[PDB]
Amino acid sequence: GSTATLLTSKLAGLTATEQRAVTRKLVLDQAASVLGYASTESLDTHESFKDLGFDSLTALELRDHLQTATGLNLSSTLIFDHPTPHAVAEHLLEQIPGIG
Secondary structure (H helix, E strand, C coil), rough: CCCCHHHHHCCCCCCCCHHHHHHHHHHHHHHHHHHHHCCCCCCCCCCCCCHHHHCCHHHHHHHHHHHHHHHHCCCCCCHHHHHCCCHHHHCCCCCCCCCC
């Protein structure tokens, strides 16, 4: 759906664990783009987007970022369903076709 092959071609090179790692960096990077960052400087993967400053605004463009980033289909309260970019990145594996 939509694309997937974009990021899916990434995870194809990883194992589920490294697939976590790569978008634990991507969701992070996106969240960074949202929040005002350029190197995920003020982010955490152990801390929830709540603390990152997301809400019914930034989470929306972040969620938007993840779907744009991955090509998969995420949701409105995505990062509030999955607390951390860690929980979200692994959530991005759930979207992945078998390889993930």
